[PDB]
Amino acid sequence: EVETFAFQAEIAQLMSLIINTFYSNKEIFLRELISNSSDALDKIRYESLTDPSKLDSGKELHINLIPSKQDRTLTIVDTGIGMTKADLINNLGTIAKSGTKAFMEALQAGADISMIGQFGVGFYSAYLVAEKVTVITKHNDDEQYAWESSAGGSFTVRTDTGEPMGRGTKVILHLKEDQTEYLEERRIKEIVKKHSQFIGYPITLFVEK
Numbered sequence: 001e002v003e004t005f006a007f008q009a010e011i012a013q014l015m016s017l018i019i020n021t022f023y024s025n026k027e028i029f030l031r032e033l034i035s036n037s038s039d040a041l042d043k044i045r046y047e048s049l050t051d052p053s054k055l056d057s058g059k060e061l062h063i064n065l066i067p068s069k070q071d072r073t074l075t076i077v078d079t080g081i082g083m084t085k086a087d088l089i090n091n092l093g094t095i096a097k098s099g100t101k102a103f104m105e106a107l108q109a110g111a112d113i114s115m116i117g118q119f120g121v122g123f124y125s126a127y128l129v130a131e132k133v134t135v136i137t138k139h140n141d142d143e144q145y146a147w148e149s150s151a152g153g154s155f156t157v158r159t160d161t162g163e164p165m166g167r168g169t170k171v172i173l174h175l176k177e178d179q180t181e182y183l184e185e186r187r188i189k190e191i192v193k194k195h196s197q198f199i200g201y202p203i204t205l206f207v208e209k
């Protein structure tokens, strides 16, 4: 049961800009995804202060970075709050619309693509390095879903039947052929140290077998 949805025009336009503009500082994508994971961990942590049963789906709050040369993927996993089906279909796009317009309005005013996270739409920087992004997510009181898009103006949502996650989000970046440097341990360590050194949750960089 795979449902296909159209992005709103403004988000499709942003995704095309990210894919089409010449911009060499592509490494910013990782800081943006780690920042989103940190925000999601903050949210479940806060909610658990008034309802401790929200951690029944997992007490550990952490971020894992997992490279796979065999699959040509870099995966960012967190045990944060996760996303509901309504988030995937509607709420993400609703929240992003204003920031996308504002980001587009900073760019021609002279701003740089690296400021994308200040407009709340840093996730889409994943398309600087990925030809396709698959997102597996599980929110308390909702099912585990898989969202996917190769930026054709459309994305898909389906119920996920893979390894149950407990709670959180996995962003799976299917890297472009010429962006495999982001599978290298030395490269990922360099990027995390430079842009993500003061995140308040443990970040584990897995090593490839």
Ligand SMILES: COc1c(C)cnc(Cn2cc(Cc3ccccc3)c3c(Cl)nc(N)nc32)c1C
Pocket (backbone or CB within 6 Å): 036, 037, 040, 078, 080, 081, 082, 083, 087, 088, 091, 092, 093, 095, 123, 135, 147, 169, 171
């Ligand atoms: C589907 O993939 C996307 C798309 C399409 C856009 N943005 C994000 C970034 N994003 C947004 C949320 C929660 C959120 C929901 C609704 C409205 C605003 C925020 C979120 C959480 Cl909880 N964790 C992580 N790791 N990333 C997140 C993702 C992953």
